[model samples]
Target chain A: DKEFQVLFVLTILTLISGTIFYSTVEGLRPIDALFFSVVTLTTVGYGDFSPQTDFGKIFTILYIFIGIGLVFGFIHKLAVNVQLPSILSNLVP
Target chain B: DKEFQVLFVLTILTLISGTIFYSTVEGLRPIDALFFSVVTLTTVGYGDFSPQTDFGKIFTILYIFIGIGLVFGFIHKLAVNVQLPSILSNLVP
Candidate 1:
């Protein structure tokens, strides 16, 4: 069964985990860490913020590979399953 | 018919057109413009390069809304359709 709720949970979990991880490991402010997590997950990597430490960089590389796919896959599933208004639906495909 | 070739052509066309447009309108070097175009379309909005002009900003807004969807959609299709080695297939959903 395709559970949208489960997908949503995982997506949010990833974001939350990334936010905490970046904030602690990268020494980014919590708000900025959240911003980076969202921006990076969306693949809209606005380089306004980046990992500075070697550990942060390595973590970021791994983070991007796994996180981007999970996030995008969630969006893809959402688009396919969600009911949108006719006007909005036209924008999706 | 799901024509992957057609999708590939359009994706490249968008990247090329954006490259030229940004180079002329934003006065970025052609190579840098191409970099920005790819970065933006991939939704990797690395703030290392962003539109500085009012017009550039406006164009970028529209560009992201349309181009991100197209590019991501193409990736989604590719992931779904292409055959992968057993190991690699596990990497995809």
Candidate 2:
């Protein structure tokens, strides 16, 4: 639940920031904005729809820093799940 | 240092797996394969140079699973830094 929540919040933030900003600044459609947000934050760095304006680039840099925490938070939860038994044994035993 | 080590090792693995496999399977050059690995693991889903063959797709799927662990590991280190004071205070005090 925690992991999902963290992931969801980050996704929404990314989507909103990416879609809203890209649409406004770059004149991209909603679908493009959403796609760009998801694609860019993941650091895929695809050149198809990258930031054209200085503000967009600045926004993207900050966005990466902001999103990476939750991205790792989500993954860390999964990593814990994979090793949960071992971690639990250490605590319980 | 620990985070750097983890990130470096994972990056290498991703590079090797992606560069080697994608090149061999997808007929991409070294740069392209490495790019593919980094991009895909990030889950950017850029749709550029995506896997055209079944094996490529399968490899990409497996690569995501493998790389996510390290990607999160790197992010987790940064996250810890952002909260290190709190975490450290807990341990010492």
Candidate 3:
């Protein structure tokens, strides 16, 4: 019936921790950090603000992986369903 | 029985999990993190290989729901043995 995953819980945790850590340690306001967190996670790149530490740079690399991996995966999933209805219809009870 | 969806699950899992983490414990190579997150979240950001703790910016609000949602949905749909075609239509006889 439901179509989600337990992994989603982990993702949520990561989001909170990631956002919080980045927000605070990065020396940005909560909103600033939260904003940065989402921007990076989603890979937006507006150029409003940015990270400024050596550690922050390293974290950025890792963060991109998380952002790209998750974003691409989700997009791919939806794409498969939406784009391939013909095949999608085949598997059944 | 199908040409997609199984890969869909893996992709979905990665996607969902990926959202969890971002600029982390040390700091992040934000590289326009805030600006970037929004652009990418909407799936529009046109840059890559760029993040710096002082660089990453902010976030986006609405997650791309339908794509990832239906994406994970179909994956769940397939796992249950329901006709994939039935889930959408125009696939089987």
Put down candidate 2 lDDT per residue, B29-83, tens digits, no spaces.
Answer: 7666666566566555556568999999988888888887786566566666654
On lDDT, the leading prediction is 1
- When sorted by lDDT, best at the front, the candidate numbers are 1, 2, 3
lDDT of 2 by residue, A1-93 (tens): 544554556567657877888899888998998888766765666668866565665565456545756555555765675467677888984
In Å, residue A91's CA in model 2 sits off its true spot by 39
TM-score of 1: 0.51
Put down candidate 1 lDDT per residue, A1-93, tens digits, no spaces: 245665677689889988899899988898999899888878877677766565665566456545666677678767777744555868987
The C-alpha RMSD in Å for every predicted model, in order, reads 8.3, 9.1, 13.3
lDDT of 1 at B93: 72
Q: Which candidate should be chosen as best, given DockQ against the real structure?
A: 1
TM-score of chain A of 1: 0.82
| Residue A10 alpha-carbon offset, candidate 3, angstroms | 3.1
Order of the predicted models by DockQ, top scorer first: 1, 2, 3
Which run of 10 residues does model 1 chain B get worst, by summed lDDT? B79-88
- How do the residues B1-93 of candidate 3 rate in per-residue lDDT, one tens digit apiece? 343446455445534432432334114344443343333444565655233333233212334333334444455656665665466666545
User: What's the C-alpha lDDT at position B93 in model 3?
Assistant: 53
Native contacts kept, each candidate: 0.50, 0.45, 0.37
